[PDB]
Design a protein around this nucleic acid. Sequence first.
DNA 1: TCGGCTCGCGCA
DNA 2: TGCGCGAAGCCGAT
Length: 456
Amino acid sequence: PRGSHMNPKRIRALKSGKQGDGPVVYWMSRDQRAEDNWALLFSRAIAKEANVPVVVVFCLTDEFLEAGIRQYEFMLKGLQELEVSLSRKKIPSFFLRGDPGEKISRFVKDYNAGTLVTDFSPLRIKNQWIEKVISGISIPFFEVDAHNVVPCWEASQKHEYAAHTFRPKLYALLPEFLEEFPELEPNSVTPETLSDVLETGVKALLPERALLKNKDPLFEPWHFEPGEKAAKKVMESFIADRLDSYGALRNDPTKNMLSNLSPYLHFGQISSQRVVLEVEKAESNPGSKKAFLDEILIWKEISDNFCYYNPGYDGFESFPSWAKESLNAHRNDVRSHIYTLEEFEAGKTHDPLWNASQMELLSTGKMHGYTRMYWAKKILEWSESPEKALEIAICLNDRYELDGRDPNGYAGIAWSIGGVHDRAWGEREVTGKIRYMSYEGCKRKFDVKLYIEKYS
DNA sequence: TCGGCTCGCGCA
DNA sequence: TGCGCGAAGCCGAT
Ligand SMILES: Cc1cc2nc3c(=O)[nH]c(=O)nc-3n(C[C@H](O)[C@H](O)[C@H](O)COP(=O)(O)OP(=O)(O)OC[C@H]3O[C@@H](n4cnc5c(N)ncnc54)[C@H](O)[C@@H]3O)c2cc1C
């Protein structure tokens, strides 16, 4: 609908209707940023064509009770900064509390909205809210993919079996969809306290905090500063200092050579399209650029593909047939060790490498990418059943990862435990034909002892 | 009816 | 450390 630097394939209609005479409302959810946001840019362009202002609404749900203070504070502090940035562009933001299915519909009527726009998430709960809102409004409802470089429904029309089949489809569409962002034009027409929501939510989550023996908190909040401004700083330091060595050291957890962008990417405080634009233009090791681009383009956006075309993305049923048949055959194998959720959570296994990985997770909220594979695969090896392993890995991932509760997490766990986007490997007890990883294999790839000593 | 897929292992 | 191979099931280009 209108636009010159505005590709209409990024937007799709969720509900037809008569465009009201009120303001355009951007229901912001996944992409919590003011710059490099196609959903906010499309909302502004529609408002300009109708000579109305654009407003932003955010609904704080009860979902923060299922996680911890680490994610709540990170999100909320980012939203406080975002509120000021939108105010500088004369864009007011409204923060609601409750069920989006009820609050968003009530806000549309009470504010006499003319058009509703939201960003795109393939998670189940977002589809439920969208269906509830459609049944409660009479104005047009649009959805914009602001998170993927290529719109999820455009990159592929089906579940992609492997990255090597998805890779040519995605890269063929890069020349069309990889582009610069236009500037967010401020509003022309003029038209709950976040500090109170922060204190009320923290007081609720306090009894569930992760503590050590001295009742001292485990989480170290100084590793990652939240917000759109801090995300840009992280990206800049990655390109200048770490991108060159990324290809060689990406799988060495003793070196801080990752981009460290996932907390910002998950909450949408930075755009992956922006990161890709800057990495494309940087002059660095070609093998490092290719390796990093493959991670933030192929693997990130195939995770959205997985969740979008497999609504059981967090269940055993989503695994490929060969993996289900293999794991079913080994359900009666004696496990060398069986640990409960509580024993995994406290890092009380026999494996010091596994315990150190859990300690990095508990203390920093961001486990290194390589040890996340080892961490999840040992949960499968030392659990009663594949379903219990899946349940334990998802629980700990979403509870403690700053970047958790994310398509990348469900696809990554499904890769580790059920071979989604992987292939069959040598037959073993318990784990069957699922790709195996061993302590001795890690010892030959990086200094395992240094990683263990850093995290007790 | 093939070719090639994001481990462990033996060997420089 | 870096390389080549093994062990596995299957998509997709034909
Ligand atoms: C068991 C398991 C659980 C994971 N949990 C999550 C999760 O909850 N949330 C999450 O965003 N990712 C998760 N990952 C993927 C990956 O581990 C992290 O995205 C990565 O470590 C994030 O840190 P980084 O940004 O410094 O990594 P970088 O090496 O700098 O990669 C940059 C970005 O590329 C994407 N990316 C990288 N690796 C993957 C991958 N394997 N799959 C999909 N996208 C990827 C990410 O968006 C990432 O932020 C998980 C992977 C596994 C195997």
